[PDB]
Structures are given as structure tokens and as C-alpha cells.
Ligand binder design. Structure first.
Ligand SMILES: *[C@@H]1O[C@H](CO)[C@@H](O[C@@H]2O[C@H](CO)[C@@H](O)[C@H](O)[C@H]2NC(C)=O)[C@H](O)[C@H]1NC(C)=O
Ligand SMILES: CCCCC/C=C\C/C=C\CCCCCCCC(=O)O
Lengths: 49, 49
């Protein structure tokens, strides 16, 4: 369920919302199509993995 | 590269906006890496925008 991430007004940095997902299947292609990534930096993993 | 010699030099160039500069990164999973261009890391290489 990514609807709370994509439905309301986003919160501010101090009031960040957290979503934890277990046992589910998500469409990563749709989420990457919704947003335009400006920069990213990953630790001990890469987004292709 | 300025102060040296190499035996060969392969240059791949294309028209590419700087707003999509994150999609050309090392571990990116965007449309560019999956369908357009995958950089090869087997020789010393540079990526210049
Ligand atoms: C993930 O979401 C995308 C939409 O962003 C789905 O792609 C659509 O799939 C339907 C059914 O085949 C097509 O009629 C649409 O034309 C597709 N749209 C786009 C923009 O590709 C995709 O099927 C979803 N992934 C899965 C596994 O269902
Ligand atoms: C930007 C939408 C973020 C959605 C977050 C929810 C799930 C994402 C899970 C893994 C993120 C992998 C993609 C990281 C960015 C790739 C950069 C690019 O595309 O070059």
C-alpha cells in the first residue's frame, strides 16, 4: 500500500512519515515513473539490486 | 588522461539532458540503464556531462 505516500500532502523533514512493508509485491516501475529523480546515494546496496 | 598515453581511446557520445544525470549513474535502475545505455566497467573509464 503506497497510497499514503502518494495521496495526501507530504510532511516536513522533522515530521517525516514512515512506511514499513512486509510480505507484499510492489510495482517499482510505476513509482519510478511517477517521480523524477534528481540525485541518489546508496550504502551497501545499489538500486538495480 | 591529460599527462599520459594509452594504447586506445573509445569515446561514446550522445545528446543527453543534465536533468537526467542521475539515470546515467553507476547503479541506477531507470529507463536509461535498462533500455538505452549501460556503461561498461572493465577498463578505466570516465563519464562526462
Ligand atoms: C506497473 O504499472 C504500470 C503502469 O505505470 C503498468 O503498465 C501498464 O500495464 C497495462 C497492462 O498491460 C497496460 O495496458 C498499460 O499500457 C501499461 N502502462 C505503462 C505506462 O506501461 C504495469 O503493468 C504494472 N506492472 C505490473 C506487473 O502489473
Ligand atoms: C523516487 C520514488 C521513490 C519510491 C521509494 C519506494 C520504493 C523504492 C525502492 C527502492 C528504490 C530504488 C530506486 C532508487 C532511485 C533510482 C535512481 C534512478 O532511477 O536512476
Amino acid at each position: 500500500d503506497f497510497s499514503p505516500m502518494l495521496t495526501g500532502t507530504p510532511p516536513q523533514v522533522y515530521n517525516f512519515r514512515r512506511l514499513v512493508f512486509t510480505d507484499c509485491n510492489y510495482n517499482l516501475t510505476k513509482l519510478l515513473s511517477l517521480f523524477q529523480v534528481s540525485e541518489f546515494s546508496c550504502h551497501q546496496v545499489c538500486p538495480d539490486a | 588522461l591529460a599527462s599520459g598515453c594509452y594504447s586506445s581511446l573509445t569515446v561514446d557520445y550522445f545528446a543527453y539532458p543534465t536533468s537526467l544525470a542521475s539515470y546515467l549513474q553507476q547503479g541506477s535502475t531507470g529507463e536509461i540503464t535498462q533500455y538505452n545505455y549501460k556503461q561498461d566497467f572493465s577498463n578505466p573509464t570516465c563519464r562526462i556531462l
